[PDB]
Amino acid sequence: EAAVYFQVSTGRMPAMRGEAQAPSKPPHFDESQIDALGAYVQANGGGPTVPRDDHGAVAQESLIGGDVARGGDLFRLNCASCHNFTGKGGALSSGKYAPDLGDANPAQIYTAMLTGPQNMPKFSDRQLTPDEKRDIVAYVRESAETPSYGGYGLGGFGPAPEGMAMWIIGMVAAIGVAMWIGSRA
Amino acid sequence: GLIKNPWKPVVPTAEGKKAVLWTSGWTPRFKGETIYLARATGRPGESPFVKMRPEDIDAGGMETVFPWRESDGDGTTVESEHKLTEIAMGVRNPVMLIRIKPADMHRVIKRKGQESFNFGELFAYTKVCSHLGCPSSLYEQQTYRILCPCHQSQFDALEFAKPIFGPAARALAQLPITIDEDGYLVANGDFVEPVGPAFWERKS
Amino acid sequence: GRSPEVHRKTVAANLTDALEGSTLKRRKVIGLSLGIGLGAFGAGTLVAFIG
Amino acid sequence: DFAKLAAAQGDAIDSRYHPSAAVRRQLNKVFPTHWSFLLGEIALYSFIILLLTGVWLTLFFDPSMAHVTYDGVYQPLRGVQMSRAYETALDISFEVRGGLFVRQVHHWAALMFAASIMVHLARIFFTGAFRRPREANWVIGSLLLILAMFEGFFGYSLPDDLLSGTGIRAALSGITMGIPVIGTWMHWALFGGDFPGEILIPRLYALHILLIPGIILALIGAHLALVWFQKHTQFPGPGRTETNVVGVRVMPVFAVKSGAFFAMITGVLGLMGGLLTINPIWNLGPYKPSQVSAGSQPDFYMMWTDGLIRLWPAWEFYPFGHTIPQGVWVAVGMGLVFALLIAYPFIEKKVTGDDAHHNLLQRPRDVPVRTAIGSMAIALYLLLTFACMNDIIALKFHISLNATTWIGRIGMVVLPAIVYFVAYRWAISLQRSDREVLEHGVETGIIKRLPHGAYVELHQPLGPVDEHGHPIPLEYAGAPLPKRMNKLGSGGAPGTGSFLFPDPAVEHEALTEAAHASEHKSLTALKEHQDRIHG
Amino acid sequence: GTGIRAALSGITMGIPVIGTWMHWALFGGDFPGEILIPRLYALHILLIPGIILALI
Amino acid sequence: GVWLTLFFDPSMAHVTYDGVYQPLRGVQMSRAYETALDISFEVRGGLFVRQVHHWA
């Protein structure tokens, strides 16, 4: 039901055609229906289950870990190759890509790496224990809601937006000023 | 004063002193030495490298492993604090260990001398790109492709990590693996070729 | 020693003409604002650099 | 009582150094007033700011690879093992009041420097300001460009983060040990051993703060001295010859303009360094051999070199148990564009067989072949630059990553040819556009509708008229021509006054009269001078 | 080391009113500190030689 | 002065020597001192250069 939760809550299922990669979209079902589908699937072979809370609901707040530094350096080694430094997009082989992590709630982040949706690998509970996963999700959630220091973020990719901003703002302003001061012909 | 001979024997191995470029962290230091495949788990003050079992990684997973000997360990003291740092900063140290689905085991091609370098459905390859040395570690587990995010060369896992796209011309190196009497993963020796980028006096 | 009288007179005339023709001395309002602004900018910049 | 104060301190200087004639000469130097000639000083103004910011970042930085544990104020990196350089770079940004602002201004100025150099180079190339006797100046500028590129590359490699480390491992280490004979000797000489070593960051620091800026300063000095003593070229126009300069004197018009331009450049750079984020090193981590991210981009002035690597095929050779890697092809290639750049004037001099001591510029439309070649080169540069960021374009815009490589690979042989053809034709068409106005006149955009039902357009002749009313054809003199009637004064001032209230009529009449008379005087002076020159 | 300790740290903090402030501005804290040698290196290889060259 | 900049490391980070000069083998020192020892003992013709520097 972890796979079902991830695929239906994020809207990937049901899929609509066969291409390089199925995109995410608005969900088709709600929480009750999601749980029903998950339980129906779980009764036909077993497998992973979504973590719950003390009230029987999906755990969101309890999945946030304490240590953000250990989560950060686990993310940088295991997850920053496909995703970005802070969780932006990344291109894959042919028509495929790793999405942005700035929209997923803790349960979604937890269940993404528990099952393995697509060309993303799966991290079992023995490879990454369900304590390191909490730190990873904490890092992912924090690096998405922290404001930029020193001005506008410019997307968070680095040299390319910086270069384009330079060319389209600084040089344009400089040339305009030069044309104002100087003369023609 | 800044002219140095690169082909000078400085590294002690199980066969005498050897040049730097011929060796790595996986080279045996004496005959019958046990090198464990360790993983980076915790903080520097909390035993950063620990042992691993074949049961930990499942089908369609990948892990990064490092060479760890019993002679280092914990890093609590100052003697093992500089020994655990050399392992993590080694140029040719990291290895990617992948587990292949049993359904896809009939389409594996070996490399004429590396026919016994795998333990069932576990394979281990160098994590260093053979083009310019970037960590080629973008592993697509359905298409079974290893992608380098530096110059966009991808390698085929089902074959002997031979390039299929990009500016790479050589295949990734394989490390032979097996299990220990306790049930931990160990090596059957080092690579049978140099790892990393090429140079003028490479190959026979 | 001293350059010939012609050079001295011509250079002095050039500088004096440059200052006088600008009509800056006749305009007290803008001649004072410039000084005040430059002083303020200098003070701010120096405090930021050293502080 | 400053009249007596300045008269005493002026005599004290003349009686000791006697620099009367020497400074009087420098106050009377005439400089042409064209916007395009202000492109060169921006770079200069960018260099000065790079020095002031470089001295403020020399009081806090520690270049060392000694590994430490952070234990600082920034919580997400608490307990992580890094180097001394990275820790000090974090300290500058988090512990010193206004350090982040200073280093952001440093980086922004670094970008502006290269951009300005590129634009200035384009100007010099297209107008033919390199012909004679100004070849050595071109060469010096070429060397300056190369030095600026390498100076910039060594700069962002100092913090020792993940991006810079990955870049320096692939570029400075991977490429180095590919050169056929001296491949590994040179590598071990540069790094003092294997790749990481322990002396690379100190060596790069000493190279970045002392040597390359010194060479740059000397070369800039030589450049400016040559420009000063070789009497800056001008453009064809009314009253311009091969043996004079038309413009304004240094004192006081030129100096005020230069100062104001410097102030505005500083303003723009300072404003840009506060509102936009550049190079956030804390979002990255310390460099580790077994870690990587998705982007991996150098700065824009180094992007074409990186894009050349991505597009060239995997062609290698294996003679007598040796190896010639792919990386060789770029190393030869990269030094081949440089060689063709420095020794261009001699190539063109040999081709066209012309060397006649030119002082008057050329409009790019008048030289089609050179314009086409320049356009082709710019197209190739742009394509190579956009090929380096093919992974970012494939993510943001929905296109295959495999498709981008092939697009670039095919494009780098096809697009330049198309650009050449289009540029050639466009230049000739712009030429033909000038011959239409010298023959018929400026089209006013007014239709007449004659009695017999014919439609004609009213033309405004630019010279004497024939007895039938058709204008006398004029000759081309390498100067621009008007094409709109509003630029010729077909439109007065709306009226003297504020934006909301008018002024008394008499003031408006007097001001209009004065302005008109002043325009007559200026035109008459130019015409008289032009008439006396050609006697 | 002893030369620096005597002639640059002891004398600096002996000056009236503006004495301890100047010491802590130069050393960035107490005497040993962590930023003295880099600062002196940058001052020795870049700034003072530049001024000397210009003045010469 | 330029030749010396290719080898020197101005840091106060404390290390243990472990070099060629035996009387200082296990001593706790700084990076600057270690590098200064390296210049004089490990680089061919370094001692001569740094002596000429001081004499000049």
Added chain:
Amino acid sequence: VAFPRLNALSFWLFLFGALIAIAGFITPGGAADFGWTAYSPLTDAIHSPGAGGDLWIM
């Protein structure tokens, strides 16, 4: 014509709009796959979530 400088703009709007709509074939997904009629709900975020359809609309 009444407005020539406006008459020129229409041709360029035509050409560039057409190019933007046709350029959906460069994407790995493809162009619009829901007919020229574009019935709903088949063009909603849930059904036809591709980027070709967006370029078609715009």
Added chain:
Amino acid sequence: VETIFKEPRWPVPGTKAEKRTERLVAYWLMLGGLSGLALLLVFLFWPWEYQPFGSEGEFLYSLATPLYGLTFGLSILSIGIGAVLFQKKFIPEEISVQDRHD
């Protein structure tokens, strides 16, 4: 050198259009001074200290460097604008010709 043209920018001695331009230059110069004073005050009195995450006072910290950049840059640019406006409104215009003895 020979100056073939030079003329004062205000021939008519007393007019209402000259005072307006003088006031415009004065306003442009005053703005730079005010911005400089603002820079001085904001550099001395502002939080400027790093705030960890999701804490009160994090918002005010994120505006420190932006305010520095605004204040230094709104002043010098304004002074530049004021100084260039003075060149083309009050300085006489000239056309000088010099022969190059090359």
Added chain:
Amino acid sequence: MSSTQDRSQLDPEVDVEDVPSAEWGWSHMPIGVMHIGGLLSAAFLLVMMRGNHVGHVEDWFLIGFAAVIVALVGRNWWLRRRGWIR
């Protein structure tokens, strides 16, 4: 004249019917450079089919582009030879 325009007179230090300002700068590239350039570019496009790629769409794209280039060069050469263009 009641206009503001000032006429310029200048004297600095393929024919004018094809390129109006033919005597003001370099305005002729010899044919044969361009033909050989085209053929060589086509050869390069054709030779890039030797690599490590496993697809064939790119190969067909390369073949098509090379064919187009060769056709253009051939047409130009034929028309220049036969006398219809100069």
Added chain:
Amino acid sequence: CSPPGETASSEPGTTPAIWTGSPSPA
């Protein structure tokens, strides 16, 4: 050119033996 010493095979290959390990440095 193709790299010599990079060849595919059709040999089955055996499962690796259990690691024993010589006790101490020789």
